[PDB]
Design a protein around this ligand. Structure first.
Ligand SMILES: *[C@@H]1O[C@H](CO)[C@@H](O[C@@H]2O[C@H](CO)[C@@H](O[C@@H]3O[C@H](CO)[C@@H](O)[C@H](O)[C@@H]3O)[C@H](O)[C@H]2NC(C)=O)[C@H](O)[C@H]1NC(C)=O
Ligand SMILES: *[C@@H]1O[C@H](CO)[C@@H](O)[C@H](O)[C@H]1NC(C)=O
Ligand SMILES: *[C@@H]1O[C@H](CO)[C@@H](O)[C@H](O)[C@H]1NC(C)=O
Ligand SMILES: [K+]
Length: 361
């Protein structure tokens, strides 16, 4: 007699589906009830967008899932499920587009968008009194989201220094995929400030680094401050010694995010079922143009939910459905090896015992 409540997932490997089932099992044990029983339904990723979308319909929506967890585009899944207002919960995708206020309105996620790295840059600027910076961003959605985020952060018996706040003397943008960025770097060289912040893809970061090298701008006096993509994979080849980048703590731990996302979903499902006039999700896509009437409400329940005991830390989502209070390892390139010199713990920079080597040091 328990009502079966299916949770869906699209995960990377069979082993992660096992982690998913175990999480759903844990959730049933956590919440005693005879009115509903949580069930796990999952698939792994298909090789292309078309097959992925079809599988979402054939394998997941056909089982009447209430939500779909998705590891790392999640684009076909977000769109296919969003059509019906079934919440899609991204476990590892960091691209800022999913945070946009106009599209992907059924999506939320347990990791922050790359644009949120700007919070950490801000604290770094405060800690080391970098009051003048140059921001170089790719002229695409991701580059501009980083810019927008950083700018937002920038914009009687007790004495105050009242020092003018940190400031971006200039924002320079480049066309993604451009192989020769000499003109841009020279434009930056003409400027006073020697603190350079970069938002760029792995591929574009290399272009920036090579141009900075050619112009002798990676040596003493300069500071390079970047995010995670700009010190990942191929971007590390020409990354200047002394550069500072970031790694999202637990950011690639799919297993941990599956556990936390299931916990959040189960909690929200129990709250949902205390409400009157709840409706069942769609059973299948074929000739079905109806939305899940309760879909939008369930997403609101999910996004306003709080799960303090996550394995990835406290879980809360902001108004765009992005994870709040993310923690980041602060990485410093030393002898061509990334060295962790501290943590941004959600609000403050906590330095450790290792010392930072600055560019040319
Ligand atoms: C990130 O680092 C910051 C700074 O160390 C941490 O904030 C600090 O947290 C402690 C413990 O919660 C706070 O102490 C407590 O403050 C309250 C009142 O505000 C009081 O009732 C407690 O008994 C105790 O004194 C401390 O004030 C706070 N400091 C700052 C600067 O806010 C924070 O906990 C770290 N975050 C994580 C997730 O680790
Ligand atoms: C990922 O997180 C899980 C917690 O479920 C932990 O058991 C595992 O050690 C983590 N893996 C890595 C490489 O951090
Ligand atoms: C749900 O719908 C019923 C039937 O119209 C209505 O009487 C009731 O007030 C509604 N319950 C809530 C809490 O909205
Ligand atoms: K969105």
């Amino acid at each position: 007699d328990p009502k079966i409540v299916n949770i869906g997932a699209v995960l990377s490997t069979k082993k992660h589906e096992q982690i998913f089932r175990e999480a759903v099992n844990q959730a049933n044990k956590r919440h005693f009830t005879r009115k509903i029983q949580l069930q796990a339904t999952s698939v792994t990723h298909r090789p292309n967008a078309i097959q992925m979308a079809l599988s979402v319909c054939e394998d997941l929506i056909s089982s009447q899932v209430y939500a779909i967890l998705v590891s790392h585009t999640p684009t076909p899944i977000s769109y296919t499920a969003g059509f019906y207002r079934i919440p899609v919960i991204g476990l590892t995708t960091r691209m800022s587009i999913y945070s946009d206020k106009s599209i992907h309105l059924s999506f939320l996620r347990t990791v922050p968008p790359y644009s949120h790295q700007a919070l950490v840059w801000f604290e770094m600027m405060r800690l080391f009194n970098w009051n003048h910076v140059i921001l170089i961003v790719s002229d695409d959605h991701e580059g501009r989201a980083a810019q927008k985020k950083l700018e937002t952060l920038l914009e009687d018996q007790l004495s105050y220094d009242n020092k003018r706040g940190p400031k971006a003397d200039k924002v320079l943008q480049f066309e993604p995929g451009t192989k020769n960025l000499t003109a841009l770097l020279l434009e930056a060289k003409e400027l006073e400030a020697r603190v350079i912040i970069l938002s760029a893809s792995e591929d574009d970061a290399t272009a920036v680094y090579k141009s900075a090298a050619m112009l002798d701008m990676t040596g003493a006096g300069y500071v390079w401050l970047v995010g995670e993509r700009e010190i990942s994979g191929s971007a590390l080849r020409y990354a200047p010694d002394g550069i500072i980048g970031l790694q999202l703590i637990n950011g690639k731990n799919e297993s941990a995010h599956i556990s936390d996302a299931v916990a959040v979903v189960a909690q929200a499902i129990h709250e949902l079922f205390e409400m009157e006039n709840i409706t069942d999700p769609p059973r299948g896509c074929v000739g079905n143009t109806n939305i899940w009437k309760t879909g939008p409400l369930f997403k609101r329940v999910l996004m306003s939910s709080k799960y303090p005991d996550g394995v990835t830390g406290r879980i809360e989502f902001n108004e765009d459905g992005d994870r709040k209070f993310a923690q980041y390892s602060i990485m410093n390139l030393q002898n061509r090896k990334l060295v962790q010199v501290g943590i941004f713990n959600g609000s403050y920079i906590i330095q450790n015992d290792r010392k930072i080597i600055w560019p040319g040091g």
